[PDB]
Design a protein around this ligand. Structure first.
Ligand SMILES: *[C@@H]1O[C@H](CO)[C@@H](O[C@@H]2O[C@H](CO)[C@@H](O[C@@H]3O[C@H](CO[C@H]4O[C@H](CO[C@H]5O[C@H](CO)[C@@H](O)[C@H](O)[C@@H]5O[C@H]5O[C@H](CO)[C@@H](O)[C@H](O)[C@@H]5O)[C@@H](O)[C@H](O[C@H]5O[C@H](CO)[C@@H](O)[C@H](O)[C@@H]5O)[C@@H]4O)[C@@H](O)[C@H](O)[C@@H]3O)[C@H](O)[C@H]2NC(C)=O)[C@H](O)[C@H]1NC(C)=O
Ligand SMILES: *[C@@H]1O[C@H](CO)[C@@H](O[C@@H]2O[C@H](CO)[C@@H](O)[C@H](O)[C@H]2NC(C)=O)[C@H](O)[C@H]1NC(C)=O
Ligand SMILES: C/C1=C/CC(C)(C)/C=C/C[C@]2(C)Oc3cc(O)c(=O)cc(C)c3C[C@H]2C[C@@H]1O
Ligand SMILES: C=C1C(=O)C=C(O)C(=O)C=C1C
Ligand SMILES: [Ca+2]
Length: 340
């Protein structure tokens, strides 16, 4: 019960890189998506080792300059989303109407070390695809969060009008996709936290869509039906509050309904009743050791279920968003024995 929790560094990428999200394979290897300097998935094999192997899986340049979110669908298949971007600068806007969803298929004899990769669907009317979460009762379908600038442009960006946030469904078998939830301020930003997004990372648990909002401090959930639409009256519910810039989160370990969420240079745990504790990073004796965490996920091997693996994209604590020093990293946090 001593805080902060124990942590160690698995791997650093080079200056300028950005590790944006993470999915754990059934065999326990990590798959991480990068936004810069290119849009790729990397694998950390056997991440419980002191010095695990880190290998490029696939660079998605054929379709996109950057990847954002990743999520597992059916076992050992993954959906990533991405688009073209005006530049590799940390402040670069996306290029409107270039978003896409792609698949990495590790399932089956032929693919379990070299995956088969394909383009699933173009999303030219989306704004910025962000987080990906499979419907647990129908795992070939995912929800995808979507929010950022309505009018992204080449630098200097001057019109920062935000698009209203929304949630898509995507059928990875047929490629069919549509918006299933939109036009609710819980999905939106008004830049209370500076330039940012509204709805960011998503996860689905039982018949609830959960998400964090990077601008209003809230973790939300929404009751959904089996096609992903909201169950009337369709009103999001606050599950927790903390005045921090949320990015992504997970439930765990194992079957526990505790939320582990990345915040502003810090990691947080939130009880289902709304109690929020800072367990790593800024606000503990960790200080600035983990700048810019972006996502987290628990280990899946029989011998690391309590290890929370954390992706990040900064090499120093930023003074302001216009002076970011990008550097991708992955750390591992030992949550063994944590309780509220
Ligand atoms: C949540 O709520 C929203 C809001 O109600 C719902 O979205 C609307 O859905 C309806 C029904 O499907 C859409 O109506 C159709 O619109 C068609 C034309 O759409 C195209 O033009 C739109 C207007 O463009 C002008 O205004 C915008 C906003 O100010 C400017 O940015 C733009 O530059 C244009 O400005 C010029 O013209 C106006 C005059 O209109 C002048 O005042 C200006 O000075 C300029 O001269 C535009 O908003 C649309 O963009 C949106 O959608 C596209 C997808 O096509 C997407 O790629 C964009 O990123 C953006 O999201 C689009 O370019 C028309 O042909 C058709 O007959 C019908 O009228 C309506 O467009 C939607 N409105 C918005 C704001 O999105 C939404 O459905 C709902 N969600 C759910 C799940 O219910
Ligand atoms: C990666 O970026 C860091 C800064 O985030 C670089 O570190 C700086 O290096 C200069 C010149 O060597 C020093 O004057 C600064 O004091 C350093 N700042 C630090 C350490 O915070 C680092 O050199 C970069 N790496 C490479 C290979 O270029
Ligand atoms: C990626 C992005 C891009 C949009 C743009 C171009 C305006 C950048 C803003 C930088 C910003 C505000 O920086 C943070 C910094 C950290 O230090 C940290 O620990 C945690 C978070 C969660 C964030 C998230 C991002 C916000 C947005 O999601
Ligand atoms: C807003 C985003 C975001 O949230 C995350 C990303 O990975 C990224 O590459 C940058 C954009 C602009
Ligand atoms: Ca994110």
């Amino acid at each position: 019960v001593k805080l902060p929790l124990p942590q160690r560094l698995l791997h650093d990428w080079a200056n300028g890189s950005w590790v944006e999200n993470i999915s754990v394979r059934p065999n326990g290897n990590l798959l991480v998506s990068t936004s810069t300097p290119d849009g790729s998935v990397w694998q950390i094999k056997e991440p419980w080792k002191d010095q695990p192997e880190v290998e490029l899986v696939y660079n998605f340049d054929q379709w996109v300059d950057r990847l954002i979110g990743i999520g597992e669908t059916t076992p050992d298949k993954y959906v990533v989303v991405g688009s073209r971007f005006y530049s590799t600068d940390p402040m670069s806007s996306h290029v409107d109407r270039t978003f896409a969803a792609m698949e990495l298929d590790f399932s089956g004899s032929a693919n379990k070390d070299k995956p088969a990769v394909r383009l699933i669907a173009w999303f030219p009317d989306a704004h910025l695809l962000q987080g990906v979460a499979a419907l647990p009762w129908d795992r070939t379908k995912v929800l995808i969060s979507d929010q950022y600038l309505l009018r992204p442009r080449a630098a200097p960006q001057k019109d920062w009008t935000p698009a209203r946030g929304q949630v898509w469904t995507l059928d990875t078998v047929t490629g069919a996709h549509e918006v299933v939830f939109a036009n609710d301020t819980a999905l939106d930003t008004t830049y209370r936290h500076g330039y940012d997004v509204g709805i960011n990372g998503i996860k689905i648990r039982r018949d609830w869509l959960y998400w964090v909002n990077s601008d209003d401090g809230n973790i939300y959930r929404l009751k959904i039906d089996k096609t992903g639409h909201a169950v009337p009256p369709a009103k999001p519910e606050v599950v927790a509050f903390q005045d921090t810039i949320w990015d992504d989160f997970t439930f765990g370990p194992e079957h526990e309904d505790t939320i582990w969420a990345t915040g502003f240079n810090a990691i947080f745990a939130a009880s289902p009743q709304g109690k929020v504790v800072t367990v790593n990073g800024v606000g503990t004796s960790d200080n600035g050791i983990m700048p810019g965490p972006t996502a987290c996920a628990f280990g899946r091997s029989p011998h690391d279920r309590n290890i929370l693996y954390v992706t990040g994209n900064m090499g120093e604590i930023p003074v302001d968003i216009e002076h970011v020093h990008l550097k991708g990293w992955v750390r591992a946090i030992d949550t063994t024995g944590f309780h509220f």
